[PDB]
Amino acid sequence: WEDEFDLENAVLFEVAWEVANKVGGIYTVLQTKAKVTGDEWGDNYFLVGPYTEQGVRTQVELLEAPTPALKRTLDSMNSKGCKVYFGRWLIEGGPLVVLLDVGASAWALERWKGELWDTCNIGVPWYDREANDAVLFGFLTTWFLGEFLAQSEEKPHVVAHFHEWLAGVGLCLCRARRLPVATIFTTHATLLGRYLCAGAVDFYNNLENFNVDKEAGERQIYHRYCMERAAAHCAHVFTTVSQITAIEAQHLLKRKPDIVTPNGLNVKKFEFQNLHAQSKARIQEFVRGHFYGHLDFNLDKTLYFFIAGRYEFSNKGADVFLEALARLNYLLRVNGSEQTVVAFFIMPARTNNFNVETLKGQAVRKQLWDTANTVKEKFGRKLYESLLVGSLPDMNKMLDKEDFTMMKRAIFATQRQSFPPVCTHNMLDDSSDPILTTIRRIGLFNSSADRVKVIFHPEFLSSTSPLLPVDYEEFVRGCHLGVFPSYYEPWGYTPAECTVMGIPSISTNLSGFGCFMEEHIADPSAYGIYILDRRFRSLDDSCSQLTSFLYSFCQQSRRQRIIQRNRTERLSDLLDWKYLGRYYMSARHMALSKAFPEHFTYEP
């Protein structure tokens, strides 16, 4: 937005446990949003966070505060028993960060807990180190805000935006001390949602039939749920990153969010068919190496699907992907479609080292490539010489005995009897792995009859990997489709990165990204976004619909595939922070309107 709003003396503090502390996905959200928030708030934008030795040592450049009230606040809090650091976060925008050492202020924790009893009726056990750190951080942030307001010679308007429950407890203290502060609360994932969905008792179907206190007591996380509910209740403005998480919060936290604030990216034109062509060539080389001695299928009609992210079988919907892969294999075999589908499972697991067959295949492909280049280069040299002489070359003589010997060596190298391995690594738990168990149960063994090959790479893609020396971005740029049929995904960063890079993707309406693109696009499938109806269908229906999506993608010609991909690169403008920051702007404006109705007015 380009709204005309008053922020002359207003100051914004964005409180989050992940400021200069990468312990989740909110770190990238804050890092990317810092630029667009700075371009609007100037030097009145601060990032409260926790003090970590590693984070400061690698990311924070300690500075001297720029306003006298800020020096007075830091000095008072440092001489009153705490240790507070002021610095600049070495990211785009270089926002000023106010880091707090929670451990150095632990000596008051017990007394502070008493305060938490006297205002909020919230108690925390001693053994919850994470919750005790959250309590310390919240008290430190509230004390910082109060001291900053006290030391200001002219009292400004403070907007405190707390992210998640870890940073949210201070919000309660901001409301229990009548501080003139506009408090916003953002939940990037409801706390009980992960545990309830992990129970596999139809989390989304029974959202209105849950006993939240009973479930928390079963999980022994009642204090955490209570403090997040208190943060959501107390906040002036309650926002969420998605509509599905908004429903989760309405039914679990018992408050309907005021705005939904989707996560964005700093899209930077990461061309599009040049990078795709090069990456597809590299993926083709890897597939040639892996399937050496079994390359009986056309590689010009091979489609590369992929799924990535954290290795959560049920949550990421990898079982649905595998079942749909088996059904699509049957569909391709019965219909006689000469299409081949190579499905990559890039999901890190506990692995020992690289498989022997996979390394041997890569070495065999390298040897074949070297042999082909050597023979081709000397053939071209002899051909050029013959053409210069003016004679039509005789191919019965342009191969000397050395070429035949080395080609025979290559042919003997390619000889192989076993089938290509499903997994490229040695899994420490072959029996305990859900992906390998499902693959061997459904029958995808990379045989010649199978039209669907499966490659499970249980490690992060790196340029230092001997197998496939390309990182995640270059690898997935050369894939045709990304399938993310997730069940519990509050926003979904892998599908969003896939869409920003221009790859058509399959998401669900149970993910935040899927809901976002469903509500922002008239016909998502035209643009390359396929949304599964996982919220109103049984899992069998979800697998059938995913199979239909995959078969429809396979039945597309090259022309339709290219057109759809082009629409997908069009789509990336929706996911930037330039467009998606207006939701945060609106949330801050409602917070200012609610906390200071006399000075600020908001028109929704």
Decide if 168 contacts 138 (C-beta within 8 A): yes
Token representation of residue 313: 């079988």
Residue selected from 261, 339, 371, 511 as contacting a copy of itself according to rule CB under 8 A: 371
Q: Cα(229)–Cα(279) distance, rounded to whole angstroms?
A: 47
Residue 194 marked in a binding site: yes
State which residue, 250 or 414, has the beta carbon closest to a copy of itself. 414
**Least CB distance from residue 90 to a copy of itself, whole Å?**
5
CA distances from 49 to 16, 25, 33, 55, 345 (A): 6, 15, 15, 11, 35
Q: Which positions from 281 to 310 touch a copy of itself by CB under 8 A, shown as an x/- string? A: -------x---xx-x---------------
419 binds a copy of itself (CB under 8 A): no
State which residue, 127 or 412, has the beta carbon closest to a copy of itself. 412
Q: Cα(194)–Cα(25) distance, rounded to whole angstroms?
A: 15
**Least CB distance from residue 412 to a copy of itself, whole Å?**
5
Decide if 584 contacts 592 (C-beta within 8 A): no
Residue selected from 107, 117, 126, 384 as contacting a copy of itself according to rule CB under 8 A: 384
The pairing of beta strand 237-240 with beta strand 181-187: parallel
**CB atoms < 10 A from the CB of 153, how many?**
8
Residue 153 marked in a binding site: no
Rg of the Cα trace of the chain? 29
State which residue, 424 or 508, has the beta carbon closest to a copy of itself. 424
Region of 97-105, 376-384, 494-502, 587-595 interacting with a copy of itself (CB under 8 A): 376-384
Residue selected from 129, 269, 401, 558 as contacting a copy of itself according to rule CB under 8 A: 401
**Least CB distance from residue 295 to a copy of itself, whole Å?**
5
State which residue, 43 or 213, has the beta carbon closest to a copy of itself. 43
- What 3-state DSSP class applies to 232? helix
80 binds a copy of itself (CB under 8 A): no
Dihedral sign for Cα atoms in the order 592, 593, 598, 601: positive
Of 275, 276, 182, residue with least CA distance to 234: 182
Token representation of residue 233: 């209740």
Residue 273 marked in a binding site: yes
415 binds a copy of itself (CB under 8 A): yes
State which residue, 415 or 431, has the beta carbon closest to a copy of itself. 415
**Least CB distance from residue 291 to a copy of itself, whole Å?**
9
Angle at 46 between CA 42 and CA 49, to 5 degrees: 160
Of 125, 134, 60, 43, residue with least CA distance to 97: 60
Dihedral sign for Cα atoms in the order 580, 583, 586, 588: negative
State which residue, 377 or 533, has the beta carbon closest to a copy of itself. 377
What torsion, rounded to 10 degrees, do the Cα atoms 420, 421, 424, 428 define? -170
Residue selected from 121, 390, 522, 523 as contacting a copy of itself according to rule CB under 8 A: 390
Token representation of residue 520: 């922002």
570 binds a copy of itself (CB under 8 A): yes
Q: What residues between 104 and 133 interact with a copy of itself by CB under 8 A?
A: none
Of 180, 178, 134, 136, residue with least CA distance to 159: 180
Residue selected from 150, 277, 281, 428 as contacting a copy of itself according to rule CB under 8 A: 277
Of 326, 321, 305, residue with least CA distance to 442: 326
Token representation of residue 67: 């306003």
State which residue, 386 or 544, has the beta carbon closest to a copy of itself. 386
Helix (H) or strand (E) holding 486: none
State which residue, 56 or 198, has the beta carbon closest to a copy of itself. 56
579 binds a copy of itself (CB under 8 A): no
**Least CB distance from residue 34 to a copy of itself, whole Å?**
11
What residues contact residue 142 under an 8 Å CB cut-off, 6+ apart? Answer: 170, 173, 174, 177, 179
Residue selected from 241, 246, 347, 368 as contacting a copy of itself according to rule CB under 8 A: 368
Could you give the angle at which helices 129-151 and 222-234 cross, rounded to 10 degrees? 30
409 binds a copy of itself (CB under 8 A): yes
Decide if 261 contacts 239 (C-beta within 8 A): yes
Residue selected from 28, 314, 544, 566 as contacting a copy of itself according to rule CB under 8 A: 566
402 binds a copy of itself (CB under 8 A): yes
State which residue, 365 or 453, has the beta carbon closest to a copy of itself. 365
Q: Cα(136)–Cα(169) distance, rounded to whole angstroms?
A: 9
What residues contact residue 275 under an 8 Å CB cut-off, 6+ apart? Answer: 474, 477, 478
Region of 90-98, 130-138, 174-182, 481-489 interacting with a copy of itself (CB under 8 A): 90-98
Q: Cα(515)–Cα(519) distance, rounded to whole angstroms?
A: 6
Q: Which positions from 40 to 59 touch a copy of itself by CB under 8 A, shown as an x/- string? A: -----------------xxx
Burial class (CB in 10 A: 0-12, 13-18, 19+), 219: middle
Decide if 162 contacts 185 (C-beta within 8 A): yes
Q: Cα(262)–Cα(242) distance, rounded to whole angstroms?
A: 6
Region of 256-264, 315-323, 374-382, 485-493 interacting with a copy of itself (CB under 8 A): 374-382
State which residue, 520 or 537, has the beta carbon closest to a copy of itself. 520
Residue 188 marked in a binding site: yes
Token representation of residue 265: 């990216």
State which residue, 556 or 566, has the beta carbon closest to a copy of itself. 566
Size of interface with a copy of itself, in residues (CB under 8 A): 61
Binding residues for alpha-D-glucose 6-phosphate: 271, 273, 276, 280, 480, 561, 565
Binding residues for UDP-alpha-D-glucose: 188, 194, 310, 489, 491-492
Binding residues: 22, 188, 194, 271, 273, 276, 280, 310, 480, 489, 491-492, 494, 561, 565
Contact residues: a copy of itself, CB under 8 A: 57-59, 61, 90-92, 94, 271-274, 277, 288, 292-293, 295, 365, 368-369, 371-373, 375-377, 379-380, 383-384, 387-393, 395-396, 398-399, 401-402, 404-415, 464, 466, 559, 563, 566, 570
Binding residues for UDP: 22, 310, 494
